[PDB]
Short mmCIF file of C-alpha atoms and ligand atoms in Angstrom, two decimals:
data_model
loop_
_atom_site.label_atom_id
_atom_site.label_comp_id
_atom_site.label_asym_id
_atom_site.label_seq_id
_atom_site.Cartn_x
_atom_site.Cartn_y
_atom_site.Cartn_z
CA UNK T 1 102.37 75.43 148.08
CA UNK T 2 99.80 73.31 150.00
CA UNK T 3 96.74 75.41 150.94
CA UNK T 4 94.43 72.69 152.49
CA UNK T 5 96.42 71.47 155.54
CA UNK T 6 93.27 70.44 157.62
CA UNK T 7 92.24 67.90 154.89
CA UNK T 8 95.73 66.58 153.94
CA UNK T 9 96.30 62.95 155.25
CA UNK T 10 92.59 62.51 156.24
CA UNK T 11 92.26 59.05 154.58
CA UNK T 12 93.05 55.53 155.80
CA UNK T 13 92.82 52.11 154.16
CA UNK T 14 94.33 50.31 151.15
CA UNK T 15 93.36 49.20 147.61
CA UNK T 16 92.04 45.77 148.63
CA UNK T 17 89.69 47.00 151.42
CA UNK T 18 88.96 50.57 150.35
CA UNK T 19 89.95 54.08 151.47
CA UNK T 20 87.78 55.79 154.08
CA UNK T 21 87.29 59.18 155.69
CA UNK T 22 85.98 59.95 159.14
CA UNK T 23 82.47 61.48 159.27
CA UNK T 24 79.87 62.31 161.95
CA UNK T 25 76.11 61.94 161.63
CA UNK T 26 73.40 63.14 164.06
CA UNK T 27 73.03 65.31 167.18
CA UNK T 28 75.07 64.72 169.34
CA UNK T 29 77.59 63.66 166.60
CA UNK T 30 78.03 59.90 166.00
CA UNK T 31 81.51 59.17 164.50
CA UNK T 32 81.74 56.63 161.64
CA UNK T 33 84.45 55.59 159.11
CA UNK T 34 83.10 56.03 155.61
CA UNK T 35 84.33 54.44 152.33
CA UNK T 36 85.18 57.13 149.66
CA UNK T 37 83.37 55.86 146.52
CA UNK T 38 83.38 57.88 143.26
CA UNK T 39 81.54 54.87 141.65
CA UNK T 40 78.16 55.32 143.44
CA UNK T 41 75.89 58.21 144.59
CA UNK T 42 74.30 57.18 147.91
CA UNK T 43 75.41 58.03 151.45
CA UNK T 44 74.54 54.73 153.14
CA UNK T 45 75.59 53.72 156.68
CA UNK T 46 75.23 50.63 158.89
CA UNK T 47 72.30 51.38 161.22
CA UNK T 48 71.75 48.03 162.96
CA UNK T 49 74.14 45.48 164.61
CA UNK T 50 76.23 43.38 162.20
CA UNK T 51 79.04 40.85 163.04
CA UNK T 52 81.58 42.90 160.99
CA UNK T 53 80.56 46.30 162.47
CA UNK T 54 81.78 47.53 165.87
CA UNK T 55 79.64 50.68 165.58
CA UNK T 56 76.59 51.89 163.65
CA UNK T 57 74.20 54.84 163.21
CA UNK T 58 71.63 54.96 166.05
CA UNK T 59 68.78 57.16 164.68
CA UNK T 60 66.83 57.06 168.02
CA UNK T 61 69.82 58.85 169.67
CA UNK T 62 69.85 61.69 167.14
CA UNK T 63 67.60 64.68 167.90
CA UNK T 64 68.06 65.99 164.30
CA UNK T 65 67.09 62.69 162.63
CA UNK T 66 64.20 63.07 160.09
CA UNK T 67 62.41 59.97 158.81
CA UNK T 68 61.66 60.04 155.05
CA UNK T 69 59.22 57.02 155.48
CA UNK T 70 60.75 55.27 152.44
CA UNK T 71 62.80 52.13 151.92
CA UNK T 72 65.56 51.40 149.38
CA UNK T 73 66.99 48.05 148.16
CA UNK T 74 70.32 48.19 146.40
CA UNK T 75 71.62 44.83 145.10
CA UNK T 76 75.07 44.62 143.47
CA UNK T 77 77.08 41.45 142.62
CA UNK T 78 79.82 42.87 144.99
CA UNK T 79 77.35 43.19 147.94
CA UNK T 80 73.75 44.14 148.69
CA UNK T 81 72.08 46.41 151.19
CA UNK T 82 68.55 47.28 152.28
CA UNK T 83 67.96 50.61 153.95
CA UNK T 84 65.53 53.13 155.41
CA UNK T 85 65.81 56.66 154.05
CA UNK T 86 66.01 59.74 156.21
CA UNK T 87 67.99 62.94 156.72
CA UNK T 88 70.37 64.21 159.45
CA UNK T 89 73.19 66.68 160.10
CA UNK T 90 76.53 65.46 158.73
CA UNK T 91 80.13 66.76 159.18
CA UNK T 92 83.61 65.71 158.04
CA UNK T 93 85.90 66.40 161.06
CA UNK T 94 89.03 66.57 158.82
CA UNK T 95 87.10 68.32 156.07
CA UNK T 96 85.60 71.80 155.52
CA UNK T 97 84.29 73.43 158.70
CA UNK T 98 80.62 73.04 157.72
CA UNK T 99 77.60 70.96 158.82
CA UNK T 100 75.17 69.80 156.10
CA UNK T 101 71.64 68.38 156.22
CA UNK T 102 72.01 65.30 153.95
CA UNK T 103 70.16 62.15 152.90
CA UNK T 104 71.20 59.00 154.75
CA UNK T 105 70.23 55.44 153.86
CA UNK T 106 70.15 53.65 157.23
CA UNK T 107 71.30 50.07 156.40
CA UNK T 108 69.08 47.61 158.31
CA UNK T 109 69.91 44.41 156.32
CA UNK T 110 72.82 43.48 154.02
CA UNK T 111 74.42 40.57 152.13
CA UNK T 112 78.26 40.53 151.77
CA UNK T 113 78.36 44.39 151.83
CA UNK T 114 80.31 44.91 155.09
CA UNK T 115 83.74 43.21 154.95
CA UNK T 116 85.49 41.64 157.97
CA UNK T 117 88.46 43.89 158.96
CA UNK T 118 87.81 46.87 156.57
CA UNK T 119 87.27 49.42 159.48
CA UNK T 120 84.47 51.30 157.58
CA UNK T 121 80.80 51.37 158.59
CA UNK T 122 79.28 53.10 155.53
CA UNK T 123 79.87 54.41 151.98
CA UNK T 124 80.05 57.97 150.68
CA UNK T 125 78.78 57.83 147.08
CA UNK T 126 80.41 60.85 145.34
CA UNK T 127 79.05 60.29 141.79
CA UNK T 128 75.99 62.13 140.29
CA UNK T 129 72.23 61.96 141.11
CA UNK T 130 71.49 60.01 137.86
CA UNK T 131 72.75 56.77 139.45
CA UNK T 132 71.42 57.43 143.01
CA UNK T 133 68.98 54.88 144.41
CA UNK T 134 65.97 54.62 144.32
CA UNK T 135 66.16 57.39 141.69
CA UNK T 136 67.72 60.77 140.89
CA UNK T 137 65.37 62.68 143.24
CA UNK T 138 67.56 61.49 146.21
CA UNK T 139 70.13 64.28 146.39
CA UNK T 140 73.71 62.89 146.78
CA UNK T 141 75.81 64.19 149.73
CA UNK T 142 78.21 66.29 147.60
CA UNK T 143 75.26 68.04 145.86
CA UNK T 144 73.78 68.92 149.36
CA UNK T 145 77.21 70.09 150.54
CA UNK T 146 77.66 72.51 147.57
CA UNK T 147 74.01 73.75 147.70
CA UNK T 148 74.04 74.48 151.47
CA UNK T 149 77.58 75.97 151.83
CA UNK T 150 80.21 78.06 149.98
CA UNK T 151 82.39 74.91 149.36
CA UNK T 152 83.43 75.02 145.62
CA UNK T 153 81.97 72.21 143.43
CA UNK T 154 85.20 70.14 143.27
CA UNK T 155 87.01 67.47 145.30
CA UNK T 156 90.39 65.80 144.77
CA UNK T 157 91.74 62.42 145.82
CA UNK T 158 95.27 61.29 146.58
CA UNK T 159 95.04 57.49 147.33
CA UNK T 160 98.35 56.26 148.80
CA UNK T 161 99.37 52.63 148.29
CA UNK T 162 102.10 51.63 150.79
CA UNK T 163 104.00 49.43 148.27
CA UNK T 164 103.99 46.59 150.82
CA UNK T 165 101.33 44.74 152.90
CA UNK T 166 99.95 46.57 155.96
CA UNK T 167 98.84 44.31 158.82
CA UNK T 168 95.65 44.85 160.95
CA UNK T 169 97.37 47.40 163.30
CA UNK T 170 99.55 49.11 160.64
CA UNK T 171 96.58 49.86 158.32
CA UNK T 172 94.80 51.60 161.32
CA UNK T 173 97.90 53.71 162.15
CA UNK T 174 99.06 54.50 158.58
CA UNK T 175 98.04 57.55 156.48
CA UNK T 176 96.20 56.20 153.41
CA UNK T 177 95.99 59.50 151.58
CA UNK T 178 93.97 62.71 151.16
CA UNK T 179 90.48 63.80 150.15
CA UNK T 180 90.54 67.60 149.58
CA UNK T 181 86.93 68.90 149.59
CA UNK T 182 86.48 72.13 147.66
CA UNK T 183 90.02 72.36 146.31
CA UNK T 184 93.40 71.26 144.96
CA UNK T 185 96.32 70.93 147.34
CA UNK T 186 99.51 71.54 145.27
CA UNK T 187 101.71 69.57 147.75
CA UNK T 188 100.00 66.24 146.73
CA UNK T 189 101.41 66.04 143.22
CA UNK T 190 104.47 66.77 141.03
CA UNK T 191 104.51 68.21 137.52
CA UNK T 192 101.40 69.44 135.74
CA UNK T 193 97.70 68.57 136.02
CA UNK T 194 96.19 67.39 132.71
CA UNK T 195 92.43 67.40 132.28
CA UNK T 196 90.15 64.96 130.52
CA UNK T 197 86.45 65.91 130.00
CA UNK T 198 83.70 64.18 132.06
CA UNK T 199 81.79 62.69 129.05
CA UNK T 200 78.46 62.56 130.95
CA UNK T 201 77.52 63.22 134.58
CA UNK T 202 76.34 59.86 136.00
CA UNK T 203 79.45 57.83 136.92
CA UNK T 204 82.65 59.88 136.46
CA UNK T 205 82.78 58.85 132.78
CA UNK T 206 85.90 59.40 130.63
CA UNK T 207 87.16 58.48 127.13
CA UNK T 208 90.36 56.44 126.58
CA UNK T 209 91.75 57.04 123.04
CA UNK T 210 94.90 54.79 122.99
CA UNK T 211 96.53 52.09 125.11
CA UNK T 212 100.28 51.20 125.17
CA UNK T 213 102.19 48.39 126.93
CA UNK T 214 105.84 49.55 127.22
CA UNK T 215 105.24 52.06 124.36
CA UNK T 216 103.75 49.31 122.13
CA UNK T 217 100.31 50.28 120.82
CA UNK T 218 97.62 47.72 121.74
CA UNK T 219 96.21 48.82 118.29
CA UNK T 220 92.53 48.09 118.97
CA UNK T 221 89.65 50.25 117.67
CA UNK T 222 89.47 52.88 120.52
CA UNK T 223 85.69 52.17 120.90
CA UNK T 224 86.77 48.80 122.43
CA UNK T 225 88.54 50.68 125.29
CA UNK T 226 85.28 52.40 126.30
CA UNK T 227 82.87 49.51 125.68
CA UNK T 228 80.31 50.16 127.18
CA UNK T 229 81.85 53.01 129.30
CA UNK T 230 85.11 54.01 131.03
CA UNK T 231 84.87 55.33 134.62
CA UNK T 232 87.15 56.59 137.44
CA UNK T 233 86.13 54.60 140.52
CA UNK T 234 87.78 54.83 143.98
CA UNK T 235 85.38 52.01 145.07
CA UNK T 236 87.02 49.42 142.71
CA UNK T 237 90.37 47.82 143.64
CA UNK T 238 91.60 46.84 140.15
CA UNK T 239 92.17 48.36 136.76
CA UNK T 240 89.21 46.54 135.06
CA UNK T 241 89.17 46.17 131.28
CA UNK T 242 86.46 45.05 128.81
CA UNK T 243 86.86 41.31 127.96
CA UNK T 244 88.55 41.85 124.52
CA UNK T 245 90.84 44.60 125.84
CA UNK T 246 91.77 42.47 128.89
CA UNK T 247 92.63 39.47 126.60
CA UNK T 248 94.86 41.68 124.35
CA UNK T 249 96.47 43.51 127.35
CA UNK T 250 97.26 40.22 129.21
CA UNK T 251 98.78 38.73 126.02
CA UNK T 252 101.00 41.85 125.63
CA UNK T 253 101.91 41.95 129.40
CA UNK T 254 102.84 38.21 129.26
CA UNK T 255 104.98 38.83 126.09
CA UNK T 256 106.79 41.79 127.79
CA UNK T 257 107.43 39.71 131.01
CA UNK T 258 108.26 36.44 129.10
CA UNK T 259 111.69 35.86 130.84
CA UNK T 260 109.52 34.57 133.76
CA UNK T 261 106.52 32.23 133.42
CA UNK T 262 103.62 32.78 135.83
CA UNK T 263 100.77 30.27 136.57
CA UNK T 264 97.35 30.80 134.92
CA UNK T 265 95.89 31.62 138.37
CA UNK T 266 98.24 34.63 138.69
CA UNK T 267 96.91 36.25 135.45
CA UNK T 268 93.33 35.49 136.66
CA UNK T 269 94.01 37.71 139.73
CA UNK T 270 93.34 34.69 142.03
CA UNK T 271 96.83 33.46 142.96
CA UNK T 272 99.71 35.34 144.53
CA UNK T 273 103.34 35.26 143.25
CA UNK T 274 106.21 35.69 145.71
CA UNK T 275 109.88 36.57 145.41
CA UNK T 276 112.65 36.54 148.02
CA UNK T 277 112.62 39.77 150.15
CA UNK T 278 113.61 42.83 148.07
CA UNK T 279 114.06 40.88 144.79
CA UNK T 280 110.74 41.64 142.98
CA UNK T 281 111.81 41.88 139.28
CA UNK T 282 109.91 45.15 138.62
CA UNK T 283 112.04 45.74 135.46
CA UNK T 284 110.65 42.63 133.63
CA UNK T 285 107.07 43.98 133.91
CA UNK T 286 106.03 46.69 131.43
CA UNK T 287 104.63 50.16 132.06
CA UNK T 288 101.01 50.78 130.93
CA UNK T 289 99.92 54.06 129.32
CA UNK T 290 96.30 55.13 128.98
CA UNK T 291 95.79 58.07 126.58
CA UNK T 292 92.81 60.21 127.52
CA UNK T 293 90.86 62.81 125.52
CA UNK T 294 92.18 66.32 126.16
CA UNK T 295 90.25 69.53 126.76
CA UNK T 296 91.53 71.03 123.45
CA UNK T 297 90.21 69.71 120.06
CA UNK T 298 92.37 66.91 118.51
CA UNK T 299 94.57 66.84 121.64
CA UNK T 300 95.19 63.92 124.07
CA UNK T 301 97.50 63.26 127.03
CA UNK T 302 98.73 60.03 128.65
CA UNK T 303 98.93 58.65 132.18
CA UNK T 304 101.58 55.92 132.71
CA UNK T 305 101.51 53.38 135.54
CA UNK T 306 104.14 50.98 136.73
CA UNK T 307 103.93 47.31 137.86
CA UNK T 308 104.28 48.91 141.40
CA UNK T 309 100.70 50.09 140.72
CA UNK T 310 99.15 47.05 138.98
CA UNK T 311 100.85 44.39 141.25
CA UNK T 312 98.95 44.64 144.56
CA UNK T 313 101.08 43.82 147.66
CA UNK T 314 99.58 40.95 149.73
CA UNK T 315 100.94 38.94 152.70
CA UNK T 316 101.97 35.30 152.06
CA UNK T 317 107.31 34.63 155.40
CA UNK T 318 109.79 37.39 154.54
CA UNK T 319 108.95 37.09 150.81
CA UNK T 320 107.44 40.03 148.88
CA UNK T 321 104.11 38.76 147.42
CA UNK T 322 101.58 40.30 145.01
CA UNK T 323 98.35 39.68 143.18
CA UNK T 324 97.85 40.82 139.55
CA UNK T 325 95.40 43.78 139.90
CA UNK T 326 94.20 43.95 136.27
CA UNK T 327 90.96 42.07 135.59
CA UNK T 328 88.21 41.46 133.04
CA UNK T 329 84.93 43.48 133.07
CA UNK T 330 81.60 43.07 131.21
CA UNK T 331 80.61 46.68 132.20
CA UNK T 332 83.45 48.66 130.57
CA UNK T 333 86.77 50.07 131.77
CA UNK T 334 87.13 50.79 135.50
CA UNK T 335 90.11 52.92 136.60
CA UNK T 336 90.17 51.61 140.17
CA UNK T 337 92.34 52.23 143.24
CA UNK T 338 95.52 50.62 141.85
CA UNK T 339 95.42 53.23 138.94
CA UNK T 340 94.38 56.13 141.25
CA UNK T 341 97.31 55.24 143.55
CA UNK T 342 99.72 56.51 140.86
CA UNK T 343 98.01 59.90 140.61
CA UNK T 344 96.49 62.89 142.30
CA UNK T 345 92.95 62.91 140.84
CA UNK T 346 90.92 66.12 140.65
CA UNK T 347 87.14 65.66 140.27
CA UNK T 348 86.38 69.12 138.87
CA UNK T 349 82.56 68.91 138.78
CA UNK T 350 82.25 72.70 138.28
CA UNK T 351 84.18 72.52 134.96
CA UNK T 352 82.93 68.97 134.01
CA UNK T 353 86.50 67.57 133.89
CA UNK T 354 88.90 65.17 135.65
CA UNK T 355 92.51 66.12 136.35
CA UNK T 356 95.51 63.81 136.62
CA UNK T 357 98.98 64.60 137.98
CA UNK T 358 101.79 62.28 139.20
CA UNK T 359 101.06 61.56 142.91
CA UNK T 360 103.59 62.68 145.52
CA UNK T 361 102.88 59.26 147.18
CA UNK T 362 103.09 56.84 144.17
CA UNK T 363 105.27 53.72 144.61
CA UNK T 364 108.19 53.57 142.13
CA UNK T 365 111.86 52.46 141.88
CA UNK T 366 115.10 54.35 140.98
CA UNK T 367 114.69 53.53 137.24
CA UNK T 368 111.06 54.42 136.38
CA UNK T 369 108.31 56.69 137.63
CA UNK T 370 104.56 57.08 136.92
CA UNK T 371 103.95 59.91 134.38
CA UNK T 372 101.26 62.38 133.14
CA UNK T 373 102.40 63.78 129.79
CA UNK T 374 101.16 65.64 126.75
CA UNK T 375 99.93 66.94 124.40
CA UNK T 376 99.61 64.34 121.62
CA UNK T 377 97.75 64.94 118.36
CA UNK T 378 94.75 62.55 118.28
CA UNK T 379 91.99 62.58 115.61
CA UNK T 380 88.28 61.41 115.73
CA UNK T 381 88.35 60.99 119.56
CA UNK T 382 84.51 61.33 119.77
CA UNK T 383 84.43 58.05 117.77
CA UNK T 384 86.12 56.34 120.80
CA UNK T 385 83.00 56.95 122.94
CA UNK T 386 80.47 54.10 122.92
CA UNK T 387 76.74 54.69 122.14
CA UNK T 388 73.80 52.29 123.07
C1 66J Z 1 89.24 50.46 146.55
C2 66J Z 1 88.09 49.75 147.10
C3 66J Z 1 87.17 49.17 147.59
C4 66J Z 1 86.05 48.50 148.17
C5 66J Z 1 86.19 47.56 149.17
N1 66J Z 1 85.15 46.90 149.71
C6 66J Z 1 83.93 47.20 149.24
C7 66J Z 1 83.69 48.11 148.22
C8 66J Z 1 82.37 48.31 147.66
C9 66J Z 1 81.21 47.57 147.78
C10 66J Z 1 80.11 48.03 147.00
CL1 66J Z 1 78.59 47.23 147.00
C11 66J Z 1 80.44 49.14 146.24
C12 66J Z 1 79.63 49.94 145.27
C13 66J Z 1 78.55 50.71 146.02
C14 66J Z 1 78.92 49.09 144.23
S1 66J Z 1 80.09 48.22 143.22
O1 66J Z 1 79.48 48.02 141.92
O2 66J Z 1 80.63 47.10 143.97
N2 66J Z 1 81.36 49.37 143.05
C15 66J Z 1 82.49 48.87 142.24
C16 66J Z 1 81.33 50.70 143.58
N3 66J Z 1 82.19 51.58 143.17
N4 66J Z 1 80.36 50.96 144.52
S2 66J Z 1 82.08 49.57 146.54
C17 66J Z 1 84.78 48.75 147.69
#
């Protein structure tokens, strides 16, 4: 049974541009579309005109706006923003029926942060205070929400990839998924939920203990899989792997799909590959299984994704085109949107654990499905975690 009907189907977007939820800030309420990001901890919104924004937060029009008289500069390689800190009343129209006083970073200047055509005007950082900017004294939105209300300390995400490209109008009209605040909606998944511990509360950090490509063990020291960390990040498009893991995984994926040769640019995630309408050879591409530390001692479980997850649909023609959505990282494993699209993901902050179940909206074919299975007997799993 599905017990959170008001929050089901409250997301829009896609893996390449991000998934967002509608929010309101200020008095009277100012509506904004907000990127759902489990990989950061700031609630930051556009608050000045920008060519790629059609709306922004107007603090002078909010009677409940409180100025914190403090600036914040947050530079990332993926985009940078400068903001002015303050507080205001915040609601999630298709969320719990509560109004919170929360910190807001009013973005006044930015460099390649807002993306042309994304439809979002801000970011909802759902990770922990440890990685909030300027420091951990700036309470993240979800912490304020739990402290001020009776909403349980848990949220769950069902990110829904369409399995095909969505044009400018389609992406605005389509349901991109669900963010259930304070609970688990049982209609969003099939089978059982399996839980992996949150290693440390900063990013949503996890431990990967084994990797298979079509059941074939990648056979690397498991520390390599979590070098220097492994995180679950709705604000990353790809499955990102540490350099050495990426090189071994791409070699194995190429060997499994060897009946068809792809250009170097395809494996670099830069070039698209196209096939005649309806003829994508899904079967030649292998499944990928990530084994995660279980809640019970010496116990693991696996999550299995299909090429329908790691081949991201892109428009070219009537051909079906894709980009390879597995890429190299120098900052550890990132289980991005293309992985999350296969699963219903429960961020159980109260019990310091992350749940995975097969998503009711994952893209598959008649021959294979994504899977969440266990238990498996796995020894010295603590040794898989990286230190320093
Ligand atoms: C699925 C999707 C998506 C998507 C699309 N367009 C923009 C973004 C982001 C830009 C920035 Cl900046 C982000 C930060 C705050 C820093 S980051 O290091 O780039 N990062 C990986 C993260 N999780 N948070 S997300 C995400």
